[PDB]
Amino acid sequence: SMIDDDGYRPNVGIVICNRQGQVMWARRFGQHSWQFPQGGINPGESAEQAMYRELFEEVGLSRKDVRILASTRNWLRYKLPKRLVRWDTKPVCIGQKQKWFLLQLVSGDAEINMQTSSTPEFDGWRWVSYWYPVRQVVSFKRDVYRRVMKEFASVVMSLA
Amino acid sequence: SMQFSKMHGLGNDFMVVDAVTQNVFFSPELIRRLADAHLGVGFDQLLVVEPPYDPELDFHYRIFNADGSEVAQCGNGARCFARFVRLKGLTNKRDIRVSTANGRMVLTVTDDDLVRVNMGEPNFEPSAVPFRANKAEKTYIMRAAEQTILCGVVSMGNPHCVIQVDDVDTAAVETLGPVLESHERFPERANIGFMQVVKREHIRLRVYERGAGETQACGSGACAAVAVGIQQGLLAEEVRVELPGGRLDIAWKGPGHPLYMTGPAVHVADGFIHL
Numbered sequence: 208s209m210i211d212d213d214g215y216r217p218n219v220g221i222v223i224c225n226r227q228g229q230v231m232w233a234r235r236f237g238q239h240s241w242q243f244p245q246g247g248i249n250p251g252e253s254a255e256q257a258m259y260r261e262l263f264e265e266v267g268l269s270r271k272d273v274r275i276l277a278s279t280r281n282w283l284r285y286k287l288p289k290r291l292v293r294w295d296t297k298p299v300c301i302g303q304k305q306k307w308f309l310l311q312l313v314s315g316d317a318e319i320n321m322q323t324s325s326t327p328e329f330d331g332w333r334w335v336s337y338w339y340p341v342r343q344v345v346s347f348k349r350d351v352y353r354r355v356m357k358e359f360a361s362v363v364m365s366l367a
Numbered sequence: 368s369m370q371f372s373k374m375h376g377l378g379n380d381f382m383v384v385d386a387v388t389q390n391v392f393f394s395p396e397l398i399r400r401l402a403d404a405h406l407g408v409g410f411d412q413l414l415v416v417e418p419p420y421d422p423e424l425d426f427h428y429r430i431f432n433a434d435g436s437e438v439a440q441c442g443n444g445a446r447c448f449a450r451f452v453r454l455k456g457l458t459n460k461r462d463i464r465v466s467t468a469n470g471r472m473v474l475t476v477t478d479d480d481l482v483r484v485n486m487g488e489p490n491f492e493p494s495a496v497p498f499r500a501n502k503a504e505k506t507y508i509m510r511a512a513e514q515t516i517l518c519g520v521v522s523m524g525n526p527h528c529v530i531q532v533d534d535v536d537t538a539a540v541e542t543l544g545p546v547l548e549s550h551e552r553f554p555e556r557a558n559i560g561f562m563q564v565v566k567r568e569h570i571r572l573r574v575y576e577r578g579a580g581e582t583q584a585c586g587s588g589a590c591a592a593v594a595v596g597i598q599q600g601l602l603a604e605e606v607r608v609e610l611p612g613g614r615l616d617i618a619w620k621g622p623g624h625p626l627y628m629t630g631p632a633v634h635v636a637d638g639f640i641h642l
């Protein structure tokens with residue numbers, strides 16, 4: 208499996224910005240919590256390959272719909288709340304380890320489509336102001352989000 | 368170590384904190400500690416910049432006093448806030464949309480690094496001041512002690528009574544101020560402005576604030592004086608206002624339009640403190 212020896216699943220997260228410097232904010236399927244797209248790196252893929260695959264699977268965007276503006280250097284880790292760990296599932300996953308990508312959406316909003324897959328992870332999306340996710344993300348991801356959005360800020364605060 | 372800045376706006380010393388990229392919770396105890404000039408940082412007020420609550424706003428910010436309580440006074444800290452978020456690279460926008468304890472605002476940072484605030488449209492209706500008078504007048508007569516005074520009256524959301532003087536340094540702000548501030552014709556009291564008109568585009572001002580006496584930089588008083596002066600045909604559409612605390616610039620196209628107030632914010636220092 209992909210779970211590392213500390214119990215962290217390798218994962219890639221996606222911050223998609225438009226030309227107004229808003230970021231894409233997506234509603235978890237059948238729930239009322241919102242987040243950025245993210246997903247597991249599969250065996251044999253690089254972080255960037257997993258990113259493009261999850262990107263199309265979750266948001267319906269192709270390579271040519273986006274441009275990579277930045278990515279974080281090293282792994283950023285968050286721990287699952289103890290209550291959500293499945294201790295019976297071997298090897299035990301206690302959290303995820305993430306590389307984050309900043310993408311500019313270069314196509315029109317209509318190219319976004321959340322139902323390319325059999326099992327969609329989102330059922331809605333909207334543009335939100337850049338720092339809004341730092342407040343609204345679920346608590347156990349907030350420290351990762353704060354660091355990600357801080358690192359990406361200079362790049363986004365440059366598209367005017 | 369928590370990063371912070373010191374800034375000066377409207378004659379007040381702000382400690383200003385980026386709580387967007389820093390993870391900090393401001394308990395009343397932490398705030399009172401930080402207010403201590405020897406144990407902490409020392410400040411008139413603490414301005415804390417946070418992520419927005421609304422996806423269509425850019426930021427939220429709070430202001431705390433040295434006692435550790437959140438203060439909710441309209442437009443307070445707005446100029447330092449707007450310059451801080453640009454100076455720290457939290458935004459590159461010139462029109463910044465922000466929520467506060469009093470509602471929401473659109474702040475505009477000008478090319479001279481001044482901050483312009485939409486203060487709304489002045490209301491001269493006596494009933495909205497509130498002011499005791501039958502109908503609105505550009506000038507009113509009021510007896511104050513055994514002296515009679517001419518004045519304009521307006522509400523910027525709060526009540527104002529504006530009196531023309533020939534020199535603000537030689538004004539009886541300390542005797543006439545109290546008498547008019549709680550004058551019986553102001554059932555909710557009023558702020559008493561003493562306006563020396565230098566030019567159609569330039570006034571000096573002292574303000575005896577409702578309940579608070581003379582302060583250094585009453586922003587709503589600057590607005591009220593310039594609104595009265597314009598309503599009276601004495602002032603241009605854009606007026607420099609010199610106050611004890613510094614300079615503001617007011618702009619108003621008269622009834623039908625909002626009035627705008629533009630002011631500086633000085634970035635005094637950066638610092639850090641371990642919490």
Ligand SMILES: Nc1nc2c(ncn2[C@@H]2O[C@H](COP(=O)(O)OP(=O)(O)OP(=O)(O)O)[C@@H](OP(=O)(O)OP(=O)(O)O)[C@H]2O)c(=O)[nH]1
Nearest residue numbers: 218235240241242244245246247287291292303328344345
């Ligand atoms: N309350 C709340 N919970 C959230 C939120 N985001 C994620 N979770 C829960 O946290 C657990 C793991 O979520 P994530 O770390 O985001 O990762 P996953 O969605 O599992 O896969 P991914 O990284 O996208 O490949 C799941 O519980 P389960 O493992 O039981 O799976 P579930 O509740 O879905 O039945 C999510 O439901 C949120 O915003 N609010």
Ligand SMILES: [Cl-]
Nearest residue numbers: 268269270271
């Ligand atoms: Cl593709």
Ligand SMILES: [Cl-]
Nearest residue numbers: 471472473485
């Ligand atoms: Cl406004």
Ligand SMILES: [F-]
Nearest residue numbers: 245246247261
């Ligand atoms: F996923």
Ligand SMILES: [Mg+2]
Nearest residue numbers: 244245246328
């Ligand atoms: Mg996912």
Ligand SMILES: [Mg+2]
Nearest residue numbers: 245246261265
């Ligand atoms: Mg996925």
Ligand SMILES: [Mg+2]
Nearest residue numbers: 246247248261
């Ligand atoms: Mg996946």
Ligand SMILES: [Mg+2]
Nearest residue numbers: 245246247328
């Ligand atoms: Mg997944």
